[PDB]
Symmetry: D3
Subunit: 102 residues, 6 copies
């Protein structure tokens, strides 16, 4: 399995997280609000966002990336994938994540 | 060192995080609330949870996993381990984490 | 690219996050509050902190570590670097992070 | 002006807040996530919710109540009006809140 | 009804809230984490706390105050009652709050 | 005592709160992040802000208002005073709030 992150305006975060679970593209999402500061086209931007921490099988990652890009309101969305130490994690939890990712 | 994640109902999060530090199974825990959406036995579940981001030596991970499973109220708890780039991290901070993990 | 974490008292979190983006040492920071429990010099410490989740090019990490250490109010600050699965992430987002990291 | 409070599931909180601002039923809304513990039909319930702290003109309250009852997903919604000390508050802020409310 | 506020250390906030709901001393509690900055014995204090926003019937307030003073870990606890506009609030919500309070 | 509310950009919320406590203009401040949706000059605005829930003595309110207007970065700042039921609240807490306010 892996963890994937994106950030969404709070309008869309929950909607999109819900869809991803309904469509079984991810097993589980944690959402929490966040304050983002970034450089964009020569300016320091400060925004209210929600982070989606998404739990998906390692092979379901490509499909997730595709879907995020379809649904995401930003020209250039964040999609950052983090590697999980699968063998140090709880075996039955990874198996669960794999099972719910169709 | 590594980072480990679990999610707990807010009732147990703080209690369990406190124990793990008192028993020196982890060096440090960050707790923050989270909204979780996941698939479970054919249903979309939506819950209030607290994420525990736990900082532990690389070899203390097995013991942490065992302890989490003993204390965790869920049939199938989340326990996800994330690999840390140890050499790009601050050396003295990893040494601290190692030292507090007995 | 990589993700880097530190935790700061809420007094300094925002200030420091802002500087790092203005100085183009990181592309983007997400800040969120956190409750931290850790062992320090024989005692269980409980504090209000803010987590800075920082997005930086893989080679800009050394400079970030140096800067964090210059600005951070703690004797021993947290600086934890997490490896990103660059090829499973969105290519154009990594390119963006690289571009904003001077 | 007055402050009104409601709690919504995260899936509806942001959507509904947005609408109330756009329709000029409230001047401003502050949303923040919350863990709700409540008694309901003989069960202790524990939910992820988002609080909407709404700023509205005194004369706009009944419309807000009406609209909240229309849009709210719950059978029995929360609508709680908090008493503002209008003389002690800042005049220009109250005026702003009056001017954005219809 | 009225709203009552207190702040607790995270280790006690969730436990205490749960009790007050179970004992039917409050109908509902919303908890959310908070950073507290306060003056105490000549020191500026900075703490992680969790706010409990409690819904109780008017006649239930003194019991709530009494129970808060019994359970609260602090020498001098916070107990602040906020004035609800009962006529402008939703009747059925107030009634619900009355019915869950003893 | 009374409760006063304002909202600030995250870059100023913590700094300003700290000052008001140090100068003994408020006894205590609770800060928490918030997503603000508000109407402003014909635009629906969506911002990251931090709420300051401030505890002050009744006679200290005007100074607090004055100081908030001085320090606040916004042209038109939020300053909203919430009505506390002083008899129903805990006497010793009110007294503490009076004693820390000048």
């Amino acid at each position: 399995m892996k963890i994937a992150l994106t950030n969404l305006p709070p309008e869309h975060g929950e909607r999109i997280a819900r869809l991803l679970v309904e469509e079984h593209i991810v097993a589980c999402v944690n959402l929490y609000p966040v304050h983002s500061i970034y450089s964009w086209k020569g300016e320091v931007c400060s925004e209210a966002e929600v982070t989606l921490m998404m739990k998906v099988s390692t092979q379901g990652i490509e499909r997730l990336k595709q879907r995020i890009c379809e649904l995401h309101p930003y020209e250039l969305p964040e999609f950052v994938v983090i590697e999980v130490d699968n063998n140090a994690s709880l075996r039955e939890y990874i198996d669960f994540v794999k099972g719910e990712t169709h």
